[PDB]
PDB file of C-alpha atoms and ligand atoms in Angstrom:
ATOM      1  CA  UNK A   5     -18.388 -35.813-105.316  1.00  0.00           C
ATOM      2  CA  UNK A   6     -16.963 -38.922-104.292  1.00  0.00           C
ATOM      3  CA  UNK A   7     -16.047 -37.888-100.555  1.00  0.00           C
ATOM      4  CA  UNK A   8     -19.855 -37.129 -99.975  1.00  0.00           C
ATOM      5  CA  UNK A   9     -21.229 -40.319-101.687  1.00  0.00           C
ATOM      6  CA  UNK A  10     -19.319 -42.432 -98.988  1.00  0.00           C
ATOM      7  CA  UNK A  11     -20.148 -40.186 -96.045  1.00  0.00           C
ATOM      8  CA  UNK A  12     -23.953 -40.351 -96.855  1.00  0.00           C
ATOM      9  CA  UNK A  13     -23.330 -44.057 -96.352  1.00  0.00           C
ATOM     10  CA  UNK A  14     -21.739 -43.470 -93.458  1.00  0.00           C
ATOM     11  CA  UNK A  15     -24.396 -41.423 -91.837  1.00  0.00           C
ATOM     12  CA  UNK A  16     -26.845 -43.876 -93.416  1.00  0.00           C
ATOM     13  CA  UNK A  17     -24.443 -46.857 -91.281  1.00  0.00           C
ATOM     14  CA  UNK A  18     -24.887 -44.975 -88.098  1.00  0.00           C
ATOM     15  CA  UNK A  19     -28.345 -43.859 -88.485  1.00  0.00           C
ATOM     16  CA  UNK A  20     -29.351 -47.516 -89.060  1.00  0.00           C
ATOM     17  CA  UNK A  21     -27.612 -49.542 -86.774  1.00  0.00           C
ATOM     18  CA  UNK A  22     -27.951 -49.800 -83.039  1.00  0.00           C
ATOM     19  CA  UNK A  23     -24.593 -51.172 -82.160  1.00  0.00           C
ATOM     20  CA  UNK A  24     -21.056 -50.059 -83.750  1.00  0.00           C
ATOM     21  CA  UNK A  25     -18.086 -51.863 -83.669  1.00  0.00           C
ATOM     22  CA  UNK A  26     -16.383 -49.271 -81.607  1.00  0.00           C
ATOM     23  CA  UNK A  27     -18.618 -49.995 -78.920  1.00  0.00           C
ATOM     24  CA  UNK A  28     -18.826 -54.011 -79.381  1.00  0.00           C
ATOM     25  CA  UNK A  29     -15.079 -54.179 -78.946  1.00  0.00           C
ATOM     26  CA  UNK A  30     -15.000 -51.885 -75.736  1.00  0.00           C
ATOM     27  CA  UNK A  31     -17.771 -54.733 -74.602  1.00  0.00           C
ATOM     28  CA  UNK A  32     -15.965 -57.553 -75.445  1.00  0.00           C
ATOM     29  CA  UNK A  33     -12.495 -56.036 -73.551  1.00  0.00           C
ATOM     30  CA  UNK A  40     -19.301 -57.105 -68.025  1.00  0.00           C
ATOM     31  CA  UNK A  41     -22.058 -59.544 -69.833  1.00  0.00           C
ATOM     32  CA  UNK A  42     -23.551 -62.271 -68.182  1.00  0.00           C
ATOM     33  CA  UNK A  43     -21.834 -65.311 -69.659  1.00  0.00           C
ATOM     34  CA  UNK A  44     -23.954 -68.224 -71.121  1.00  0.00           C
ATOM     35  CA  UNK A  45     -21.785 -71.331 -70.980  1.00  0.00           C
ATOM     36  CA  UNK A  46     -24.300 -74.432 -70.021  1.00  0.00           C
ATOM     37  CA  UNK A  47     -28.115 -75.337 -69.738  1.00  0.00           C
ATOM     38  CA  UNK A  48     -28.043 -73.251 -66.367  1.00  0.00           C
ATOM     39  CA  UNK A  49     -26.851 -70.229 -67.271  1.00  0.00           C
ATOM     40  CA  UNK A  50     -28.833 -69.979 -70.575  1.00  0.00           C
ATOM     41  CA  UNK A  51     -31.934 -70.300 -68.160  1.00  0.00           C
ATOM     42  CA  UNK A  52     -30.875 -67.841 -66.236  1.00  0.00           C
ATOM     43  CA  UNK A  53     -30.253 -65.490 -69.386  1.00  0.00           C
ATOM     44  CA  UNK A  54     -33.639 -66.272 -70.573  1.00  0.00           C
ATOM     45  CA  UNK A  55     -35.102 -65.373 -67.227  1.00  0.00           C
ATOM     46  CA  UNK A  56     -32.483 -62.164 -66.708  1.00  0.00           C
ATOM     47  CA  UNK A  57     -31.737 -60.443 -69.722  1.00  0.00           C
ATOM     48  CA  UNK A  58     -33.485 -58.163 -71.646  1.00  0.00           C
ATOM     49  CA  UNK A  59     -33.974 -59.680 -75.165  1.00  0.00           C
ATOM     50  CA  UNK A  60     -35.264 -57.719 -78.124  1.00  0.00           C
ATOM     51  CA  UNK A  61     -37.643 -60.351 -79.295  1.00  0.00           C
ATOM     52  CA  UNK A  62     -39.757 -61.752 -75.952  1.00  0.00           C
ATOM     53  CA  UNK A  63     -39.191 -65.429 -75.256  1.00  0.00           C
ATOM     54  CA  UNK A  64     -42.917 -65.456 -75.125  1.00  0.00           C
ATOM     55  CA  UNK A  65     -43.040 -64.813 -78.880  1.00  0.00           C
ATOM     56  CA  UNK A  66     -41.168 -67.329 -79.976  1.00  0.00           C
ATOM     57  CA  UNK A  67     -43.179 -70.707 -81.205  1.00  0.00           C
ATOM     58  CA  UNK A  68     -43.178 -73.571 -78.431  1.00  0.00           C
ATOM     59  CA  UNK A  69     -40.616 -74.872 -76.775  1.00  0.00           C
ATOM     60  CA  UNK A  70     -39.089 -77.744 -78.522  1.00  0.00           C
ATOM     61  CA  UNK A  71     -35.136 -78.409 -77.084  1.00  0.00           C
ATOM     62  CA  UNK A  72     -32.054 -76.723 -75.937  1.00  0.00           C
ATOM     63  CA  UNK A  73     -30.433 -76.665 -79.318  1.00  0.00           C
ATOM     64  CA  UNK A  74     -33.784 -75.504 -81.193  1.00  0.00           C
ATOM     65  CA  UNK A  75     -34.330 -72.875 -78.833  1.00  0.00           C
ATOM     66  CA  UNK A  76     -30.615 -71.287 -79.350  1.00  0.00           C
ATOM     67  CA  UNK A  77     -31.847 -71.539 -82.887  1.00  0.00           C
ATOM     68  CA  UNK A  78     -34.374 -69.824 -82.718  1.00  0.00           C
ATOM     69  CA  UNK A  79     -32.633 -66.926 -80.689  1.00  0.00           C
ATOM     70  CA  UNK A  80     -30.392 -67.157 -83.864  1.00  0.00           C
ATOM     71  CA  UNK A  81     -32.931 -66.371 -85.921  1.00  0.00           C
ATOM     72  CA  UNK A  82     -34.408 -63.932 -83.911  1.00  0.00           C
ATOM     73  CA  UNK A  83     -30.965 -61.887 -84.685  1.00  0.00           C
ATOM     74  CA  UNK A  84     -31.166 -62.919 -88.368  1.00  0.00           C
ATOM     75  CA  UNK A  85     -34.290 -61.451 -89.184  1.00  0.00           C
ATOM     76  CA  UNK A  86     -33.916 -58.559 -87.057  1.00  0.00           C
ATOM     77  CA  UNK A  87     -30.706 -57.367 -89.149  1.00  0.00           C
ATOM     78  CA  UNK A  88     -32.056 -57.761 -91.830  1.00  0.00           C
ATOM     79  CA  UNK A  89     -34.569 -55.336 -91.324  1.00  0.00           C
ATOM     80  CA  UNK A  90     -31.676 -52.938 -90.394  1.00  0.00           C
ATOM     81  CA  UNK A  91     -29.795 -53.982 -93.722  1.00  0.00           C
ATOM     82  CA  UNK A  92     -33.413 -52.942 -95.699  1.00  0.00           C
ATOM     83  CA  UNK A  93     -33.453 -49.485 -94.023  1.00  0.00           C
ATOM     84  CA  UNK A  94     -29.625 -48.794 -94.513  1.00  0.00           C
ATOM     85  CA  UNK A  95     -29.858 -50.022 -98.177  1.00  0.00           C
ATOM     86  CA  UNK A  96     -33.510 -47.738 -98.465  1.00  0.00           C
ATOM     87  CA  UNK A  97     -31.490 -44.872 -96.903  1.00  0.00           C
ATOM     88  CA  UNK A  98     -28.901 -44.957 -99.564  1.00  0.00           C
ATOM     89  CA  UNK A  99     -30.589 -42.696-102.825  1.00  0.00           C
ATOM     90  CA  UNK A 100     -28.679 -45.173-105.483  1.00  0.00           C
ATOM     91  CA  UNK A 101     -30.110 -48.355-103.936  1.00  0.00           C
ATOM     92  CA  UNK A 102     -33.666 -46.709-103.715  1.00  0.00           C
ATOM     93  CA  UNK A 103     -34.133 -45.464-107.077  1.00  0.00           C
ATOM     94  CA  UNK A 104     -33.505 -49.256-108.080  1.00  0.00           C
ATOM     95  CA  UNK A 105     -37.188 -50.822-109.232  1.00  0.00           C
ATOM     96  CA  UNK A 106     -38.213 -52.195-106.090  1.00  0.00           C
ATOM     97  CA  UNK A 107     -38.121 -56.000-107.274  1.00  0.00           C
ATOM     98  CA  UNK A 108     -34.190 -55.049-107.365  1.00  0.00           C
ATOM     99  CA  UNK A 109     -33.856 -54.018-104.612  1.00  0.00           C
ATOM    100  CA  UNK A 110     -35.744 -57.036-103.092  1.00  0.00           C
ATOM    101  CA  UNK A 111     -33.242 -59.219-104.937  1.00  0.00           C
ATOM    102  CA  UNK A 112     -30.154 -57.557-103.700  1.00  0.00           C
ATOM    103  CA  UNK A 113     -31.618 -57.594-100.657  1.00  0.00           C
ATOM    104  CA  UNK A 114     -32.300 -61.450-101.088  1.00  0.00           C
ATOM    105  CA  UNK A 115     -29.243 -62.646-101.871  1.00  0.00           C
ATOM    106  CA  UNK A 116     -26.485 -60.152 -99.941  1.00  0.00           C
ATOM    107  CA  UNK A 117     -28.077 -60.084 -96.457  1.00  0.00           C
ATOM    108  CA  UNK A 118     -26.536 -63.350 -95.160  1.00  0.00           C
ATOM    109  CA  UNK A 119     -23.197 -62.249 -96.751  1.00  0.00           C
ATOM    110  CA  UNK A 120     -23.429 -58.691 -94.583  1.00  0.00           C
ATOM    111  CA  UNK A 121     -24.842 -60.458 -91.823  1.00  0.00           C
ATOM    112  CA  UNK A 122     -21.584 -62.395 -91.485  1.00  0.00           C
ATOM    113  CA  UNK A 123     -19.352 -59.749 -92.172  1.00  0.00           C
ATOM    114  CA  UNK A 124     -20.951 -56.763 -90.055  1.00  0.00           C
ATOM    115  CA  UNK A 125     -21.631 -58.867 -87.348  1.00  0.00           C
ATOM    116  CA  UNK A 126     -18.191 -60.519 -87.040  1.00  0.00           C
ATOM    117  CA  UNK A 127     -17.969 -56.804 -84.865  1.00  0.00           C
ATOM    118  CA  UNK A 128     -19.852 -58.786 -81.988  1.00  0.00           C
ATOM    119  CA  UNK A 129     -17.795 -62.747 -82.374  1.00  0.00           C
ATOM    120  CA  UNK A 130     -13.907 -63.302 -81.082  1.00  0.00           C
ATOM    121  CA  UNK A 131     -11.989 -66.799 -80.383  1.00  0.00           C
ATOM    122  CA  UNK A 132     -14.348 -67.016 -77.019  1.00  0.00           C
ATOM    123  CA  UNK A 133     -17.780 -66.451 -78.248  1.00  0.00           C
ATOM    124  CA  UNK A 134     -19.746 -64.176 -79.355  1.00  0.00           C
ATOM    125  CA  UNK A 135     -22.458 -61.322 -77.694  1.00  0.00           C
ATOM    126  CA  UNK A 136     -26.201 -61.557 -77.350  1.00  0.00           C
ATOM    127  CA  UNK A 137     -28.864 -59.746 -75.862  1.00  0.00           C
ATOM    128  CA  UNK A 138     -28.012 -56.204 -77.267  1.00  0.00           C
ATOM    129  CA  UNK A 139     -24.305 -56.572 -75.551  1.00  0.00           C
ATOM    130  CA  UNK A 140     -26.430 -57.933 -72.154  1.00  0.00           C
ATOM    131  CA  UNK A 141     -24.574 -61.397 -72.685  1.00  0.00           C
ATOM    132  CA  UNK A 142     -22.008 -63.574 -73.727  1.00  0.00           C
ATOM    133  CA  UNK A 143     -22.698 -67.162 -75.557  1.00  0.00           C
ATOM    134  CA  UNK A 144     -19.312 -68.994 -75.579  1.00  0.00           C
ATOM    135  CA  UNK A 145     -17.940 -71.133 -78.573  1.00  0.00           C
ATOM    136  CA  UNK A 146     -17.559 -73.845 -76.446  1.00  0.00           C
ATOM    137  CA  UNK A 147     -21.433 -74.061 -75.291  1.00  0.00           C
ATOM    138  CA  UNK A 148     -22.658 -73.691 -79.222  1.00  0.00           C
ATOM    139  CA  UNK A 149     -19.884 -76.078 -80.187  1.00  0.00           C
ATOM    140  CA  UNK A 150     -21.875 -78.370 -77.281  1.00  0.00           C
ATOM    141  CA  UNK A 151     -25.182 -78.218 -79.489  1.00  0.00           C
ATOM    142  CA  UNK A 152     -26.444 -81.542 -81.019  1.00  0.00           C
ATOM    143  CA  UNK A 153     -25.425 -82.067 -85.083  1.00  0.00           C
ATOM    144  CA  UNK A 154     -26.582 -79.800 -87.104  1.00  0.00           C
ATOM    145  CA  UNK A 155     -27.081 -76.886 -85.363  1.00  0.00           C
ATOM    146  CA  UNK A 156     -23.080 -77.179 -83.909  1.00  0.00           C
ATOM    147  CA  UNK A 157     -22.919 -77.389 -87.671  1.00  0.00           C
ATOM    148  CA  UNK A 158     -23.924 -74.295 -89.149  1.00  0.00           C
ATOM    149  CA  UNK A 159     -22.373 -72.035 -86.165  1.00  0.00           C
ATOM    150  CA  UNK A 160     -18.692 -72.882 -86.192  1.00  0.00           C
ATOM    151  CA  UNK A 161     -17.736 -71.761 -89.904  1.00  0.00           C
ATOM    152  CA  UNK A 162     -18.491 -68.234 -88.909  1.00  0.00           C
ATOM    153  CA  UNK A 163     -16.471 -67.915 -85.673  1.00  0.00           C
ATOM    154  CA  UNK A 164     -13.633 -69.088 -88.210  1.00  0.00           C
ATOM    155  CA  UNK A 165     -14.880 -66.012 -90.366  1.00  0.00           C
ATOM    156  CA  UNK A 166     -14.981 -63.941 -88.093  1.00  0.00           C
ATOM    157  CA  UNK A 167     -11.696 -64.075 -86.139  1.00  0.00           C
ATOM    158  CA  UNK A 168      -9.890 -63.724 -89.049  1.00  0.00           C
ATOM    159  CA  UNK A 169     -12.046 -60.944 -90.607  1.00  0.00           C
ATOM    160  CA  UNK A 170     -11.582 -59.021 -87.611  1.00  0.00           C
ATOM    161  CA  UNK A 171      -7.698 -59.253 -87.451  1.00  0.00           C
ATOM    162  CA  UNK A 172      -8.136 -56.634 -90.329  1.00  0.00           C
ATOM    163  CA  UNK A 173      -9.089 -53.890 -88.001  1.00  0.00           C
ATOM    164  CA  UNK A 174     -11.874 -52.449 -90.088  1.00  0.00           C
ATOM    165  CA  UNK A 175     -13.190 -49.581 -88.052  1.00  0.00           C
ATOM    166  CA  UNK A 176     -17.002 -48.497 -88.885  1.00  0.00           C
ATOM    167  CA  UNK A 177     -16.937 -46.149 -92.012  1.00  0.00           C
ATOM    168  CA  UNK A 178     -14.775 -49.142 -93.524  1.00  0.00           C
ATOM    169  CA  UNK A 179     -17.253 -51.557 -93.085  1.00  0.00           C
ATOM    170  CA  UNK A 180     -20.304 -48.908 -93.962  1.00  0.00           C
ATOM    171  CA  UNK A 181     -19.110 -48.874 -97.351  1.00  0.00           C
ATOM    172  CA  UNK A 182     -17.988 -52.621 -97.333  1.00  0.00           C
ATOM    173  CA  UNK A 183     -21.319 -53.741 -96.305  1.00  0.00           C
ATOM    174  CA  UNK A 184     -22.597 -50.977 -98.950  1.00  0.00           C
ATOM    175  CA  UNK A 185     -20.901 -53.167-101.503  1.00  0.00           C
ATOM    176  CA  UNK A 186     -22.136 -56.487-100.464  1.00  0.00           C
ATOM    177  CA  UNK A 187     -25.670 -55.400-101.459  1.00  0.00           C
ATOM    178  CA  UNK A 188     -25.447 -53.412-104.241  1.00  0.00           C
ATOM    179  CA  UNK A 189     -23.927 -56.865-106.223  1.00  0.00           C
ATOM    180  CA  UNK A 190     -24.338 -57.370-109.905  1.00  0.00           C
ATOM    181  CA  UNK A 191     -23.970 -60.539-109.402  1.00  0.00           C
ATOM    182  CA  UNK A 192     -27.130 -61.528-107.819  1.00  0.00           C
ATOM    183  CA  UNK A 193     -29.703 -64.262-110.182  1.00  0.00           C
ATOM    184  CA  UNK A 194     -32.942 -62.692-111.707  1.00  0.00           C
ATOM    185  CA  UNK A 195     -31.441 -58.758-111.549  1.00  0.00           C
ATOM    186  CA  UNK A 196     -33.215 -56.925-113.452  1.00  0.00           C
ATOM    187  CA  UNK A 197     -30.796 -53.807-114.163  1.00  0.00           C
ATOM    188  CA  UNK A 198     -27.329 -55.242-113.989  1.00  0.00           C
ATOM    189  CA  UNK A 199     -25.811 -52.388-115.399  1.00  0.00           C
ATOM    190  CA  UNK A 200     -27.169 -50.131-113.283  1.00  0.00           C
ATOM    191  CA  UNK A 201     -25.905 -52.398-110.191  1.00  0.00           C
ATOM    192  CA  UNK A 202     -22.621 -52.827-111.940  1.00  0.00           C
ATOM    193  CA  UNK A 203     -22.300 -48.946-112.334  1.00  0.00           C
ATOM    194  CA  UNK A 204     -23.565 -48.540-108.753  1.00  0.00           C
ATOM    195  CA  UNK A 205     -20.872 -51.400-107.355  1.00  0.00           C
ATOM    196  CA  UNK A 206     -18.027 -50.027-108.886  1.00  0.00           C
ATOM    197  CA  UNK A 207     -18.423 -46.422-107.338  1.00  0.00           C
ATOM    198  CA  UNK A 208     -18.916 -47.910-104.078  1.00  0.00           C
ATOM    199  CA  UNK A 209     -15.426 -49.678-104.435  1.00  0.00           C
ATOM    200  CA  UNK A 210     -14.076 -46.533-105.353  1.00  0.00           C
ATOM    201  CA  UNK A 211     -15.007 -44.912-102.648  1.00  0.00           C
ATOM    202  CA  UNK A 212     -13.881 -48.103-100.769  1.00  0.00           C
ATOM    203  CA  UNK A 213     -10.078 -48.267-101.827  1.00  0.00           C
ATOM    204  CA  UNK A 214     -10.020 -44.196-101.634  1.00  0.00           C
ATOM    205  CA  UNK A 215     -11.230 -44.630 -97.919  1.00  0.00           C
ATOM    206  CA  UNK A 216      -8.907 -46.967 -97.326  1.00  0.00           C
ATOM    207  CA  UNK A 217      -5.973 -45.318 -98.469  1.00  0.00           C
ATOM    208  CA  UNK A 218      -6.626 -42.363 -96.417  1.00  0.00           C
ATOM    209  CA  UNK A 219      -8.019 -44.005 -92.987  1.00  0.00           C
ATOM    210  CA  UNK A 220      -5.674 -46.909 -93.257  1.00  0.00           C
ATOM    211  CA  UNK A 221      -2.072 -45.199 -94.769  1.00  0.00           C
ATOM    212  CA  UNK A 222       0.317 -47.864 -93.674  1.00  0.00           C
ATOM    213  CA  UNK A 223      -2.088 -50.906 -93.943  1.00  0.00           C
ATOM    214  CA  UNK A 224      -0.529 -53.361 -97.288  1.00  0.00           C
ATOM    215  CA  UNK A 225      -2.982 -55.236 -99.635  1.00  0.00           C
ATOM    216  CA  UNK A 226      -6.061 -54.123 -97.701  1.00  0.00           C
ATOM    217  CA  UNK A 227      -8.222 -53.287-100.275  1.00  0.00           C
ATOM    218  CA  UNK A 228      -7.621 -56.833-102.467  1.00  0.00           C
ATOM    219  CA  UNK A 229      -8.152 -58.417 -98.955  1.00  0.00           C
ATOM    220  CA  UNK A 230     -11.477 -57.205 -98.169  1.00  0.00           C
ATOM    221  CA  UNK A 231     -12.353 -57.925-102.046  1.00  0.00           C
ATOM    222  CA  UNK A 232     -11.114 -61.419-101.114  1.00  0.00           C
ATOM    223  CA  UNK A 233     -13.335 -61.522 -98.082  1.00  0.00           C
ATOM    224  CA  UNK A 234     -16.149 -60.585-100.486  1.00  0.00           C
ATOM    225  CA  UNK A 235     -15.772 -63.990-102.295  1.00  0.00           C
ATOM    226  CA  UNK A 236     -15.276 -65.790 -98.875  1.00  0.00           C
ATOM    227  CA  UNK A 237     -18.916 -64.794 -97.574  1.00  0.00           C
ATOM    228  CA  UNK A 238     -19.815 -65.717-101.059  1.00  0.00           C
ATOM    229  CA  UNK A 239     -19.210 -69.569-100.317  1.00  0.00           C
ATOM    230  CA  UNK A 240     -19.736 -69.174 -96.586  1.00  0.00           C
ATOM    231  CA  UNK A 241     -23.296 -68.561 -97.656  1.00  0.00           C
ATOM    232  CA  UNK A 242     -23.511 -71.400 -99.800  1.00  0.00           C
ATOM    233  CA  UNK A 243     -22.072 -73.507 -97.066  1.00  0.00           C
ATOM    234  CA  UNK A 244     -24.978 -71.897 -94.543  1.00  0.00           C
ATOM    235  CA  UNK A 245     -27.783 -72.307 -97.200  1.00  0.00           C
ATOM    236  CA  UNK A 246     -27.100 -76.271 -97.721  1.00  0.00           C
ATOM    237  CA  UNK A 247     -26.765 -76.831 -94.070  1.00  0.00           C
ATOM    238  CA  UNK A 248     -30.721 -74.774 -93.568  1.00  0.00           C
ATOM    239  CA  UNK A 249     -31.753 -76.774 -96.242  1.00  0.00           C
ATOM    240  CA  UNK A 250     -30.715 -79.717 -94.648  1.00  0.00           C
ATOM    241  CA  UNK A 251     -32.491 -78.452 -91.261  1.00  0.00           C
ATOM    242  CA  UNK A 252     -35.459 -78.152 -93.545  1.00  0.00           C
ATOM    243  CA  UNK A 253     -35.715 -81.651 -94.654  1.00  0.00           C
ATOM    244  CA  UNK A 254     -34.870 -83.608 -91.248  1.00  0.00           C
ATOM    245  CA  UNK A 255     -35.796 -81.356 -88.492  1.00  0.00           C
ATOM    246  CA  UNK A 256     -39.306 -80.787 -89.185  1.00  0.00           C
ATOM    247  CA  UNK A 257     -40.338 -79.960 -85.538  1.00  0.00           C
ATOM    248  CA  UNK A 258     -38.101 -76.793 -85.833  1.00  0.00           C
ATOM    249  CA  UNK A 259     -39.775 -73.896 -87.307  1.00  0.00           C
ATOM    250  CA  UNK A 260     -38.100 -71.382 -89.699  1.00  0.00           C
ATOM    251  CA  UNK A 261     -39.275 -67.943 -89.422  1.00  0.00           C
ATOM    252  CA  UNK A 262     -41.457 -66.672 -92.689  1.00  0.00           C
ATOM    253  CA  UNK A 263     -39.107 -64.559 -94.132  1.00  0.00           C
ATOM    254  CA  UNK A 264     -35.901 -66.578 -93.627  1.00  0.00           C
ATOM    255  CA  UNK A 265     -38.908 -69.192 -95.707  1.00  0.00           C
ATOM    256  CA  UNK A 266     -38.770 -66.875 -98.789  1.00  0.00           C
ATOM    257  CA  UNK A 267     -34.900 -66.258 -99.080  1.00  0.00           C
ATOM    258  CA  UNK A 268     -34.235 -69.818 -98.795  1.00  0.00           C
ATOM    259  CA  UNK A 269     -37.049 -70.919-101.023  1.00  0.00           C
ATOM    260  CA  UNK A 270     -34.532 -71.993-103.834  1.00  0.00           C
TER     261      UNK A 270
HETATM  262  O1  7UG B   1     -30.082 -68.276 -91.676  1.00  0.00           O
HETATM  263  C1  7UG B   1     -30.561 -67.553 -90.777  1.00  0.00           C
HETATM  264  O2  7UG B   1     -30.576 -66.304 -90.843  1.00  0.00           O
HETATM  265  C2  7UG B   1     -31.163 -68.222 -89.565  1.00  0.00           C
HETATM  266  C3  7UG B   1     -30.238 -69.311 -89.042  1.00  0.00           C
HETATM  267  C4  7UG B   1     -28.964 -68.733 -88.439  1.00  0.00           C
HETATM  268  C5  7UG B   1     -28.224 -69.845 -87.706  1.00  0.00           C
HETATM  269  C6  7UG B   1     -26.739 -69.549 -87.560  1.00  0.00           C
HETATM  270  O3  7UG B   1     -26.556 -68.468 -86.652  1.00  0.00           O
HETATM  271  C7  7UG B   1     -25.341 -68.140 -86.120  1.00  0.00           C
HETATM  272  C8  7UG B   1     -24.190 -68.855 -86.425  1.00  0.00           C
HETATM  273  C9  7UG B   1     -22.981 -68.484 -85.865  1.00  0.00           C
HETATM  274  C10 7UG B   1     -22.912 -67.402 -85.003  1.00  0.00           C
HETATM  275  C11 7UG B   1     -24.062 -66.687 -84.702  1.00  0.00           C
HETATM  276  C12 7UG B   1     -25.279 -67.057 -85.264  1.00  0.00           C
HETATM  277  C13 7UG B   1     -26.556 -66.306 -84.970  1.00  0.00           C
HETATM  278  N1  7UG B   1     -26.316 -64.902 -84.655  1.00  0.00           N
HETATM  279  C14 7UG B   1     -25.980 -64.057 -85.803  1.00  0.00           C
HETATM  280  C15 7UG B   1     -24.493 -63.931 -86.074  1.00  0.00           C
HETATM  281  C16 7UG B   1     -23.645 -63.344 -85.146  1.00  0.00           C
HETATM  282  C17 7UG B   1     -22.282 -63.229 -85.414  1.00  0.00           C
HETATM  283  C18 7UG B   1     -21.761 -63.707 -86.613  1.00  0.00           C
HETATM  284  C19 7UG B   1     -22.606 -64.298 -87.546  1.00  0.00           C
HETATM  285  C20 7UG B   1     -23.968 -64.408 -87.274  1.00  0.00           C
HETATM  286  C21 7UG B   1     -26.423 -64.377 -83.433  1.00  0.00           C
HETATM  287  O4  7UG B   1     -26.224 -63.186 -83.265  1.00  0.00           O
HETATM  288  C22 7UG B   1     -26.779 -65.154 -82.195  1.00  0.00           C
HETATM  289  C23 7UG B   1     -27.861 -64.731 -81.440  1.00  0.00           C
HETATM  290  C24 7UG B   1     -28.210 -65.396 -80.274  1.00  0.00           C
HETATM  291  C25 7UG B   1     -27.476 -66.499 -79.850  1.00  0.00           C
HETATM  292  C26 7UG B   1     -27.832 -67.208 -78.585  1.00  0.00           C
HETATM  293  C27 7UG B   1     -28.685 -66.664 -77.599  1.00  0.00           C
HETATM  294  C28 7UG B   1     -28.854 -67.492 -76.495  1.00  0.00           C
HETATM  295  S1  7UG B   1     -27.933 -68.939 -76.681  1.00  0.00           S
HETATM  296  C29 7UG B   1     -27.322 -68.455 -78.221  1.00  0.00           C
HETATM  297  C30 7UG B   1     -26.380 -66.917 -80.599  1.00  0.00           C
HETATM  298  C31 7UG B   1     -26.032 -66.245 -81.763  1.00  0.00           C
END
């Protein structure tokens, strides 16, 4: 019963995402490496990037254009998030203005957490694993754009020094979303009932694929209230991008979850 509701989130985990875990950690232990102005033209000009640098809106500086690539990952996770969450039978028999809401207000949370696969103390990857942005070079962006990047390398490297392998984070992720938590739910029983099964299945994975590990599952549950304010931390700082930088653009959906 159980042991199949966390493998159809597995499958679900693997049939939605392009890059595991297992294969950005082989990566990261080569990509081009994009430490200054020069070798981010070159990357530009070089790599293959999923979103064309002709689509994005005009050129405006350094630091808005790696913000822009930044949203260019953003958006494009979530729409992996939405078809893992769709693929998932309890999150699509939810009333679709649920699942919008879930949707809504856990992306950014699994965004963080899933890709903290692709981030260690050096930088992180870019360009579907083609590249390598350094710390340093983001670190080297103007205020507040240095801002909003740093608190998640310190997520990150300490989220990944619990060695979650893939079908532990399917079914972490799996619980971001599926919050009860979440303002305007509609159903938050439902949710409720749906969270609490996929914790289950969490700590029951867990046990089994991590014998020897201590206090794993309460970490992870800790982790869950960490991305909580690591959002809240991320949405003040775009609101604050909002208000003073209005040359930079903010793609339309990004718009309508920060909208609050
Ligand atoms: O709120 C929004 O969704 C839009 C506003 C996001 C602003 C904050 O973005 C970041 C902050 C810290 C780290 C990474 C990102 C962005 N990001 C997602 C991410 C990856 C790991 C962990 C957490 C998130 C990226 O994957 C990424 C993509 C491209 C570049 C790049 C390309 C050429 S020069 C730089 C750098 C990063």
């Amino acid at each position: 019963d159980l042991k199949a509701f966390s493998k159809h989130i597995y499958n679900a985990y693997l049939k939605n995402f392009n890059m595991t875990k297992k294969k950005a950690r082989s990566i990261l232990t080569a990509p081009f490496v994009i430490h200054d102005i020069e070798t981010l033209w070159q990357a530009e000009k070089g790599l293959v990037w999923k979103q064309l640098v002709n689509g994005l809106p005009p050129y405006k500086e350094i630091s808005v254009h790696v913000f822009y690539r930044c949203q260019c990952t953003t958006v494009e996770t979530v729409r992996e998030l939405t078809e893992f969450a769709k693929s998932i039978p309890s999150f699509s028999s939810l009333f679709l203005n649920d699942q919008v809401t879930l949707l809504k207000y856990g992306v950014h949370e699994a965004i963080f957490a899933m890709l903290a696969s692709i981030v260690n103390k050096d930088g992180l990857l870019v360009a579907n694993g083609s590249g390598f942005v350094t710390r340093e070079f983001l670190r080297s962006l103007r205020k507040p754009f240095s801002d909003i990047i740093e608190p998640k390398f310190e997520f990150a490297v300490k989220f990944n020094a619990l060695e979650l392998d893939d079908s532990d984070l399917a079914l972490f992720i799996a619980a971001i979303i599926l919050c009860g938590d979440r303002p305007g739910l509609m159903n938050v029983p439902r949710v409720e009932a749906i969270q609490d099964t996929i914790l289950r299945a969490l700590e029951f994975h867990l046990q089994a694929n991590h014998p020897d590990a201590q206090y794993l599952f309460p970490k992870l549950l800790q982790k869950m209230a960490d991305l909580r304010q690591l959002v809240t931390e991320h949405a003040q700082m775009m609101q604050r991008i909002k208000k003073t930088e209005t040359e930079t653009s903010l793609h339309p959906l990004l718009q309508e979850i920060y909208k609050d």
